[PDB]
Amino acid sequence: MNMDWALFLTFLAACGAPATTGALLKPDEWYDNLNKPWWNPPRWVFPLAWTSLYFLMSLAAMRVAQLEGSGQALAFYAAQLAFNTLWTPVFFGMKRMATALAVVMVMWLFVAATMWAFFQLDTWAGVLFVPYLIWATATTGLNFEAMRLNWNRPEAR
Amino acid sequence: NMDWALFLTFLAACGAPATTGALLKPDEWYDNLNKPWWNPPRWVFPLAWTSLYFLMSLAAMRVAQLEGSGQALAFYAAQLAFNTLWTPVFFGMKRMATALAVVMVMWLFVAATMWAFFQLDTWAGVLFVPYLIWATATTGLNFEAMRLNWNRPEAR
Ligand SMILES: C=CC1=C(C)c2cc3[nH]c(cc4nc(cc5[nH]c(cc1n2)c(C)c5C=C)C(C)=C4CCC(=O)O)c(CCC(=O)O)c3C
Ligand SMILES: CCCCCC/C=C/CCCCCCCCCC(=O)O[C@H](CO)COC(=O)CCCCCCCCCCCCCCC
Ligand SMILES: CCCCCCCC/C=C/CCCCCCCC(=O)OC[C@H](O)CO
Numbered sequence: 283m284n285m286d287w288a289l290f291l292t293f294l295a296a297c298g299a300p301a302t303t304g305a306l307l308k309p310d311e312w313y314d315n316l317n318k319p320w321w322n323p324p325r326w327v328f329p330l331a332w333t334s335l336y337f338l339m340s341l342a343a344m345r346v347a348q349l350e351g352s353g354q355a356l357a358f359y360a361a362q363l364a365f366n367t368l369w370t371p372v373f374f375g376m377k378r379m380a381t382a383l384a385v386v387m388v389m390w391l392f393v394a395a396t397m398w399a400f401f402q403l404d405t406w407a408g409v410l411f412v413p414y415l416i417w418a419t420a421t422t423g424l425n426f427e428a429m430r431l432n433w434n435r436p437e438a439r
Numbered sequence: 440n441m442d443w444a445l446f447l448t449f450l451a452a453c454g455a456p457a458t459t460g461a462l463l464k465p466d467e468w469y470d471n472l473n474k475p476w477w478n479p480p481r482w483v484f485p486l487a488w489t490s491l492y493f494l495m496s497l498a499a500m501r502v503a504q505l506e507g508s509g510q511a512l513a514f515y516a517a518q519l520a521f522n523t524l525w526t527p528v529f530f531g532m533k534r535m536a537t538a539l540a541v542v543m544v545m546w547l548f549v550a551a552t553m554w555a556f557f558q559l560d561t562w563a564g565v566l567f568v569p570y571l572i573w574a575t576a577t578t579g580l581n582f583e584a585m586r587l588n589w590n591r592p593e594a595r
């Protein structure tokens with residue numbers, strides 16, 4: 283087991299894709315106007331939390347990718363990352379709060395699955411995913427309360 | 440041989456970019472863009488991407504069973520994420536120049552995945568060849584969309 287920079291940088295570069303979804307966000311009166319739960323973090327917290335999570339999830343995947351039988355785990359990892367990438371444009375760009383809730387719940391499921399499969403192969407890789415599952419849980423809660431606490435207009439059928 | 444749990448996991452992962460296409464059907468904005476002469480008709484695209492989701496998932500299923508496939512699957516994760524990113528940037532936000540950067544990075548990781556797949560399993564490499572071809576065409580379309588509509592602010 284090693285600090286493998288080819289692996290680590292590949293997984294980190296892959297995080298550049300969800301990172302870009304956040305980068306292309308702007309101040310948005312729609313978002314500012316939303317009713318929010320008391321425990322909602324300020325806007326500046328989210329890029330810092332996500333950057334930390336990108337590094338942790340990449341290091342976890344780096345460890346696992348060096349182990350025999352890691353195929354299912356990395357398939358879950360690929361799914362987790364793609365739904366993560368999908369969520370921000372659906373919620374912030376398309377303003378489809380209901381569809382975004384479906385997306386983040388699928389994300390949550392593949393984050394949980396990835397974490398479970400990582401623990402099966404390597405404890406530290408599983409542990410690194412725990413703050414990710416926790417943040418994903420909070421993020422789902424925010425999407426849900428956003429839906430519950432506000433006016434929602436119909437999406438396209 | 441055939442590992443259904445693996446294949447279905449990879450196929451499910453394709454549900455994410457497949458969803459971007461479902462939620463962002465080509466705009467009246469898109470139809471009014473100046474198109475390069477070789478632009479395919481609209482029905483070609485969901486045909487192409489649906490086929491590619493099945494081919495790339497088949498390829499990944501084969502590779503994920505093999506020893507030493509970690510770097511290959513890391514590339515696969517990378518290309519899928521940038522694939523998922525591209526449609527919302529181009530069709531959603533209509534930032535054509537940013538989208539070009541995204542699809543070029545996508546292209547690189549599709550090429551890297553293909554190469555990596557070939558080192559481990561010839562058939563998985565072959566399944567990625569039409570993907571690299573299509574990503575090349577997509578990159579060209581995105582480049583031409585800019586070049587041919589440079590008077591639009593969203594092209595620059
Ligand atoms: C005040 C300005 C910004 C706010 C509130 C912001 C908030 C968010 N950014 C998100 C996505 C993101 N923003 C991110 C980095 C950035 N974030 C940026 C600007 C902002 N991004 C810029 C600019 C970034 C580029 C460095 C990243 C990296 C993500 C990716 C989230 C994900 O799903 O991976 C998400 C979705 C996930 C969640 O709810 O936990 C929120 C809420
Ligand atoms: C949008 C930001 C994403 C970064 C864009 C850079 C992507 C370039 C594509 C790389 C293709 C790899 C080359 C394939 C052929 C090499 C031979 C081979 O395929 O086999 C080599 C031998 O194992 C593999 O070498 C490598 O692993 C090189 C890949 C390194 C990945 C790029 C790292 C970029 C640094 C990350 C910076 C931070 C990112 C943002 C943080 C959120
Ligand atoms: C919302 C975010 C909340 C969490 C924020 C945390 C802030 C970052 C601190 C953690 C450092 C973790 C270190 C992880 C690096 C260890 C893995 C690794 O380096 O492995 C090396 C190689 O595998 C040989 O063992």
Ligand SMILES: CCCCCCCC/C=C/CCCCCCCC(=O)OC[C@H](O)CO
Binds near residue numbers: 324327
């Ligand atoms: C050992 C110490 C470790 C330190 C490592 C670096 C920490 C970087 C982030 C700090 C804040 C993290 C939690 C942020 C909670 C924000 C709550 C809030 O709303 O504060 C807004 C602020 O008051 C507006 O002026």
Ligand SMILES: CCCCCCCC/C=C/CCCCCCCC(=O)OC[C@H](O)CO
Binds near residue numbers: 406409410412413
């Ligand atoms: C379950 C609690 C998780 C919630 C807390 C979230 C904060 C970030 C946690 C990261 C754990 C890793 C940090 C400690 C560094 C690990 C050292 C390492 O992994 O080294 C491997 C090798 O076996 C020896 O060096």
Ligand SMILES: CCCCCCCC/C=C/CCCCCCCC(=O)OC[C@H](O)CO
Binds near residue numbers: 401417
């Ligand atoms: C407002 C929302 C705030 C956040 C809400 C809280 C989120 C709860 C998440 C749970 C993470 C706990 C996961 C712990 C799983 C550990 C599994 C384990 O350790 O299994 C190891 C074993 O060796 C295998 O073989």
Ligand SMILES: CCCCCCCC/C=C/CCCCCCCC(=O)OC[C@H](O)CO
Binds near residue numbers: 447453454
């Ligand atoms: C166009 C792309 C759209 C994407 C849509 C893709 C949806 C795929 C998910 C199916 C879940 C079905 C769950 C069935 C899981 C069965 C697992 C299994 O039985 O595996 C056996 C194992 O391989 C024995 O060794």
Ligand SMILES: CCCCCCCC/C=C/CCCCCCCC(=O)OC[C@H](O)CO
Binds near residue numbers: 354388445447452457
């Ligand atoms: C288009 C809308 C989005 C569509 C997306 C559908 C989301 C549901 C995902 C499918 C289930 C994936 C099936 C994977 C089951 C594998 C379970 C498994 O293999 O367990 C691990 C194994 O035991 C240890 O190696």
Ligand SMILES: CCCCCCCC/C=C/CCCCCCCC(=O)OC[C@H](O)CO
Binds near residue numbers: 536537539543585
């Ligand atoms: C490792 C990272 C490598 C990948 C990063 C690649 C980034 C390239 C991005 C392009 C920005 C836009 C510049 C492209 C301009 C093409 C359109 C053009 O301007 O056409 C000429 C004129 O506008 C018509 O008359």
Ligand SMILES: CCCCCCCC/C=C\CCCCCCCC(=O)OC[C@H](O)CO
Binds near residue numbers: 323324327417
């Ligand atoms: C288990 C290790 C942690 C894993 C998960 C990492 C999550 C921590 C990251 C940032 C949260 C800080 C933001 C918290 C700010 C809450 C919003 C707030 O400021 O509300 C104040 C209210 O008025 C009275 O509490």
Ligand SMILES: CCCCCCCC/C=C\CCCCCCCC(=O)OC[C@H](O)CO
Binds near residue numbers: 557558559560561
């Ligand atoms: C515009 C730029 C155009 C560039 C387009 C090319 C990009 C990919 C380069 C190499 C492909 C070949 C990858 C295979 C490398 C050797 C594979 C080998 O091991 O053999 C394969 C198979 O398993 C039995 O031959």
